[PDB]
Amino acid sequence: EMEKEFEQIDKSGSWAAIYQDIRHEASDFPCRVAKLPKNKNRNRYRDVSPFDHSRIKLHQEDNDYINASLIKMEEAQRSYILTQGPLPNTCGHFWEMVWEQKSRGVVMLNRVMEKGSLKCAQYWPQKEEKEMIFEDTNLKLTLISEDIKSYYTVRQLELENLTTQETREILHFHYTTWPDFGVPESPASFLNFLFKVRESGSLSPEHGPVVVHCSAGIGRSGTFCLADTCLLLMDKRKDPSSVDIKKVLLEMRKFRMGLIQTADQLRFSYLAVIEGAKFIMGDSSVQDQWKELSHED
Template structure:
């Protein structure tokens, strides 16, 4: 990490306001920059670009949003033209909060953030995963400033553990693949993959997806 970058992150690290763990801060070479000014503290989000070149897969690996980074998360979705968000954790695991409620549900069909409204179009319950079709609206850009985003949440993969069922995990992966949201060309937009810290479960998911694509 360069001295300039380290200085820029000093406030973030000391306050612990934008990352679950200080040890899991992202590095300058691969981090996602919000907006156009990489030197602005407001440009920081705990997310990194990852590509598997032989599979032509592009991803963004991210931590689960905090209460004060939900707007940043949806800004990243908007700016990066993200077609799908793949969530690999529950909101609450073993009595600990692992992620803010940044998405709508059947009980709360619309959630508002500073710059975005996130609306639920439909929700489907599958075995061990939930599919939400979301309408993302950007404030202040007129009626046409909205996009569809697929949100898939796998619910049976404990932190520091393994999925409850290999079959169910692969069924979820095949569902995502069938919706043509994963990149097939080097310049296709990335999907966001996140768990709580954006490392273990997220990294495992993209490795399985990338290897299966190369094999097939």
Template sequence: MKTAKDHLLKQFYEHEKVAAKSWMNIFQAINSQTAKRTKTLKLTCKSAYSVENVDKNRYRDISPYDQNRITVGSEENYINASPVPVDETGQNYILCQGPLDETCADFWQMIWEQNVPTVVMLNKLIERGMLKCSPYFPSKSVQEMTFEPYKIVCESEEEEGDFTVRVLSLHLDGVEEVKSVVHIQYTEWPDFGVPKSTANLLHLMRRYWELHGRDNTCPAVVHCSAGVGRSGTFVVVDTVIRLIEADTEVDMEKLIVKLREKRMGLIQTPQQLRFSWQTIVDYFQFQCDGSKGDEPSSSSGINGEESELGGRKREWSSDGRDEKLAKRRAMIAGMVARSRKSEKGKGSSSSYLSTLPFSLPIVAVSSAVFIAAMAYYHYSR
């Protein structure tokens, strides 16, 4: 008898046979279904586009729906954030944009009022030479930040490969209660792109499960720059893994369309769609007792084509698959061992620059090119 996992794997392999064309067709079908649902449900964004709120949006085309948005303080107080409850798994997320300078206090007010124990940040502060998120959190180098009436203190910070885990304490003026917030920042996920391998994301997912708790129903805030592409991929992967583990059959297209009713534009490219599916497939095919052993799949190559991030995609023919699995498991075991050895050898001290939560690229460009780039990225989103 076929399981929900078998059904998902079969679908993935069928799509891979026709490669890029299939993923593009699926993505376009999702967009078409989303447009119909948006019209049917009469979803609007009047609050986001109002005169008093329009400058609180990082991008002009990514806004929360009036019918499903987080409010801070009162119903009139706007923030670009959307609650995304998933009834089938009992999990709750809040997807939001990376805070702007003028919305950092609103962000922490949301964390306080919504009792958020975990924040997952999937971007750097600066990407492609552009500020994609204001520095709203303290770190080892800057241990305390204040956005009145909130004060945030970095209690600890640990680097774990491609991501950093911080434990923050959140204080509100005049209130004795102090709230603890785990802040997980993943720094190797390019805007509009995907990580170098599924292993990277699976490592992040497992740490998220450990730190947030698999059965925690309190909302986790997930954000990138816009709060739809990378953030949407994260939520889809987490949701589908939970459903398949419960042997619940999943229709990926319908799931994404349903989630988009809560947050517009969730998953932005065919590449992100494929990568989310690939990550789920690899989780079930290459896990070892659910805690180690990830297949470092190519992030974007299809049917042997060179991926944007290097490497070549696997061919998914049935011939010799057992042998391939054995080789991959051996390679993965070696990677895990080397990673653990490297972590043990790391020192506890680091320079000021290495503790910064972002990198500052040094580029020599004329002012005209810089201004043109700013305009392009602002209006293309």
């Protein structure tokens, strides 16, 4: 059981060892397409690639490659697409992927600039009157509105397939206070944000998989998805004790390498799930408490 395990690990001060064991046991599958010469400029980081078996293929005969993986959680019955922060030449591909996969939401866990360098291209419009056109994939993107909170912003975007003139509403959830290789300010802030995403319908089965990204699409993104899946699993049978967090993380790592980048992100993942469990088990008022403690206003 996670809370007792949490205490055992904290007491023995062995998060580093627990975390390293997960890395040792993590799946290793080929990433041949990602490593092809023609795709070198479609990858942000040399050591972070999508496995071939779970990579998202763009529906174009040209080059179907994008650094994105489909994490399909069978038991939990939820899917997520984890991808890297778009590069200046892959913003059209990113939106092509959102369209073809029928995604309703995009969860961004990083800032365009972190630690003095560019971690992601400005792939969405910052002003209503300045829409963006991705000519390579023939897609149009317009900012419809935005709701800025203290540590996250929610934007409503309109994505249009210029070929058919079909349009869709895309919700953008931008967590702005999560440091690279770091952890959220508190389980509260993180949980308040995850539940904001959930309440929007973006994670629902009627839509395609939500697109989740940070800079590499494995650390913060992994932490976000692990927490969500674990909470959904204990929701399925109202049995928090049946959920094995390490087991769930290992299952997710069969779909994309390096999910959860530090021992403290793993430790934070446990904290988020244990605190989130109060809501799952019937204490509805805890959601208001998180909102309060997160200081979003």
